[PDB]
């Protein structure tokens, strides 16, 4: 029935057009509070985010899922304020990414489970704001710690009904190892979204996961250093495949009958401290439409390539509603 | 003239007996706010700290230096509240230890200098509370990033007069490489305290740095896993040297004419999430006196060993005052 947002619970019908993998800011635990000037100022950052969210809203976007975890420097008060100002629903996350501090790294699977449930049931910090999704990540073979995270995510998800979303090194087929772990925990593939999936050209790897019931996240659409090949850091981060190439993978899965398994996003942000300095400048040049890139550019492109409008609606409205809706096992 | 504390500035005379390397809680950036229950509750942690601090105060302690950096999970609001409640002065720190997040790891020396100056001049977070010391760390051969930290710490120190205090792998003689970098930045050894120095028996190493004008921090006095050796984790962390063995290093240095360069502490805490679970329990059992260990146990021991009381007063009152006073070159 309900999905938790930074402003409280909403009905499924209110979610509307939803972007499933985004961020307001990409940072580190405690960073925004300790060194806000890094982003100009907190106020500057929020203003930027409000502007961008209002542009997306104008394009039809009603809800965004900010997959920033504790270690991505998620600031739930920042999220609640921009959500309120832009009038865009924002779903917050729990989980752990690739930069856990010692206090997290030394924890057992049981303790991590506890922390995840806490964020989901009790709320984040002392705000009472509850997480609506669990974010995990691997980059190649899972380290022993990552395996604990994955198990903990599965158990919290089994207890709550809240979905799991991941970061993958698609090219290395991480999705298959993640699936194996999740399944070993009893987790249903339909509660899981294997992200950054458009980062690969191997459709066989994709279709195989889709066939198992997993959701495939094609969330790096606008990421391309194409024409920027002169920037080591940019090219390393964004890649050299064109946005068109990534978008056609959406059509490809549709064509194979997996429309119900597709989730699309931009993986955008408004501030980014966990990388080289001034990186935002480059991204903003690369994708001036920011989070509105999907509705403004991708939808129309697909339409033109022959994808029927309703299919497009099912992908951006229906699939996400199903995914987000907390669902308990048999 | 004045030293910055979490409740504001104090004059040097007001510092009195000062513990130079301690912590209220050993954690990680954002952890306390995100998972306070890991420590029972924020309240419980706070109550535990107030009692401990009141007990040290009863023993004569007037000021403590909490060397918790951003990456140690320093919560200045927590510090301000326990300080007020126990009536003990608390000096806060800036710097970086060994668990910096990516957002910090990717910064240049210039950016890091700016961040340290911010905490010292403008204040921590939005509190307006200013740091009165810079904490840095190495663990054997410095890493490239650690070299950047040390240089930025040096620069912030040269611009503000605030001292620098370090964590070393004493056994590995880290202090030597630290000194080299600081000196390469033009920093006076007298603005530096090389910590965890009682972690080693090498007096040759210690008198060498002392002879150079550096302050020697003997702050692991009560750390010992003797009898607790059935515990790998505790042993790894505490070592197997007795507190008396560490305490005698103090007497040794005094004997060599380095009384003015010694700074003693306990390196205690009331919460500890950055290690194995339940480690506190073990520590509390090893040193039930907590921060009062120094005045209750060490001072009398040294006295009994022949050290003059006045000397003891110089080490615990005079030395720290001089070290802490912001001093420009
Ligand atoms: C099904 C009718 O679309 P929708 O409910 C949400 C929606 C808006 C824009 C696009 C491109 C797709 C979906 O329209 C809102 C006014
Ligand atoms: C000179 C007298 O020391 P002091 O100023 C601070 C002080 C107290 C106790 C000990 C063990 C050392 C130093 O005593 C005030 C109570």
Swiss-Prot record, chain A:
The modification N6-carboxylysine is found at residue 135. GO terms for biological process: catabolic process. Its EC number is 3.1.8.1. It catalyses: An aryl dialkyl phosphate + H2O = dialkyl phosphate + an aryl alcohol. It comes from Brevundimonas diminuta. InterPro entries: AryldialkylPase_Zn-BS, Metal_Hydrolase, Phosphotriesterase, TAT_signal. Has an unusual substrate specificity for synthetic organophosphate triesters and phosphorofluoridates. All of the phosphate triesters found to be substrates are synthetic compounds. The identity of any naturally occurring substrate for the enzyme is unknown. Has no detectable activity with phosphate monoesters or diesters and no activity as an esterase or protease. It catalyzes the hydrolysis of the insecticide paraoxon at a rate approaching the diffusion limit and thus appears to be optimally evolved for utilizing this synthetic substrate. This is Parathion hydrolase. GO terms for cellular component: plasma membrane. Predicted to be exported by the Tat system. The position of the signal peptide cleavage has been experimentally proven.
């Amino acid at each position: 029935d309900r999905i938790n947002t930074v402003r409280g619970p909403i009905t499924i019908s209110e979610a509307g057009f939803t972007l499933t993998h985004e961020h307001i800011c990409g940072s580190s635990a405690g960073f925004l509070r300790a060194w806000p000037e890094f982003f100009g100022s907190r106020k500057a950052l929020a203003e930027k985010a409000v502007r961008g969210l209002r542009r997306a809203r104008a394009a039809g976007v009603r809800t965004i899922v900010d997959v920033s975890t504790f270690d991505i420097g998620r600031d739930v008060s920042l999220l609640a304020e921009v959500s309120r100002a832009a009038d865009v629903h924002i779903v917050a996350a729990t989980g752990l990414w690739f930069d856990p501090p010692l206090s997290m790294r030394l924890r057992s699977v049981e303790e991590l489970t506890q922390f995840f449930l806490r964020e989901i049931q009790y709320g984040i910090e002392d705000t009472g704001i509850r997480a609506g999704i669990i974010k995990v990540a691997t980059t190649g073979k899972a380290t022993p710690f990552q395996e604990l995270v994955l198990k903990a995510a599965a158990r919290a998800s089994l207890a709550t009904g809240v979905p799991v979303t991941t970061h993958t090194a698609a090219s290395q087929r991480d999705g298959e190892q993640q699936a194996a772990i999740f399944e070993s925990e009893g987790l249903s593939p339909s509660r899981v979204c294997i992200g950054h999936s458009d980062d690969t050209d191997d459709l066989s790897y994709l279709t195989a996961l889709a066939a198992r019931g997993y959701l495939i996240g094609l969330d790096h659409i606008p990421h391309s250093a194409i024409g920027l090949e002169d920037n080591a850091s940019a090219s390393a981060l964004l890649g050299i495949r064109s946005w068109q190439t990534r978008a056609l993978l959406i059509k490809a899965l549709i064509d194979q009958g997996y429309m119900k398994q597709i989730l699309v996003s931009n993986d955008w942000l408004f501030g980014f401290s966990s990388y080289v300095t001034n990186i935002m400048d480059v991204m903003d040049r690369v994708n001036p439409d920011g989070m509105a890139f999907i509705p403004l550019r991708v939808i129309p492109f697909l339409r033109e390539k022959g994808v029927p409008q309703e299919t497009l609606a099912g992908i951006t409205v229906t699939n996400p509603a199903r995914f987000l809706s907390p669902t308990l096992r048999a």
